Each structure stands twice: as structure tokens, then as C-alpha cells.
């Protein structure tokens, strides 16, 4: 098991079930399943860096119970 939290600019936070080896795109696909956002508009930021689709959570040193910030391109970024 590994949970991470996804927080938007309004403070709304959700929990995802992931693994360290999941890609950033895998996380965007989970957010589309849960909330309906199109992945190509989801921007994820960790440690102030915009996260690349093809890199893994472990490549960003995202830990269990880490928070990743979300914003929607052309909507609220």
C-alpha cells in the first residue's frame, strides 16, 4: 500500500492509492477516473517542480503521505 494526497489551490484534497514505481501519467489517469479531469490538462507540482508524465513518483522522492499540488491548465493554473 502507498497513499499520496492531491491538493488543489482551494485546499480540496483527495487520496490516491499508488506505488513508488507509478509514473506521473499513472497518477493523472487516477485523477481522471476519480474527478473527471482530462489528463492532458492536469498539471502536478511537487517540491516546486512541475512533474513530467514519464518520470516516476520515486524519481521525485514522493513519499507515502506526501502532498502533490494540482491545477487545471487553461482553467485555474
Q: What does this molecule look like?
A:
With 77 residues, the protein is of the alpha+beta class. It is built from one helix and five strands; from the N terminus they run E-E-H-E-E-E. It has a single domain, classed as Ubiquitin-like (UB roll), CATH 3.10.20. It has one helix at residues 24-35; strands at 3-7, 13-17, 42-46, 49-50, 67-72. A five-stranded mixed β-sheet has the order 2-1-5-3-4, with helices on one face. It starts with a strand and ends in a 5-residue tail after the last strand. Disulfide bonds join 71-77. This is Ubiquitin.
- The share of residues in extended strands comes to 25-35%
Structural class: alpha+beta
In spatial order, strands of the major sheet run: 2-1-5-3-4
- Structural shape: globular
**CATH class descriptor:** Alpha Beta
Percent helix among the residues? 10-25%
CATH topology value: Ubiquitin-like (UB roll)
Head-to-tail CA distance between termini: 31 Å
String of helices and strands = EEHEEE
Total number of beta strands: 5
Number of helical segments with 4 or more residues? 1
Sheet bearing the most strands, described?
5 strands, mixed
**What assembly state would you assign to the polypeptide chains in this entry?**
monomer
Second rung of CATH, namely the architecture: Roll
The CATH homologous superfamily is named Phosphatidylinositol 3-kinase Catalytic Subunit, Chain A, domain 1
- The overall number of domains is 1
Radius of gyration: 11 Å
PDB class: cell cycle
Keywords: ubiquitin-like protein, cell cycle
Assembly: monomeric
Entry title: crystal structure of human ubiquitin-like protein from Bacteroides fragilis
Amino acid at each position: 500500500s502507498m497513499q499520496v494526497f492531491i491538493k488543489n489551490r482551494y485546499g480540496w484534497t483527495i487520496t490516491l492509492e499508488v506505488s513508488p514505481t507509478d509514473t506521473v501519467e499513472n497518477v493523472k489517469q487516477k485523477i481522471q477516473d476519480k474527478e473527471g479531469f482530462p489528463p492532458d490538462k492536469i498539471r502536478l507540482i511537487y517540491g516546486g517542480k512541475q512533474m513530467e508524465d514519464g518520470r516516476t513518483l520515486a524519481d521525485y522522492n514522493v513519499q507515502k503521505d506526501s502532498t502533490i499540488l494540482i491545477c487545471i491548465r487553461d482553467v485555474d493554473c
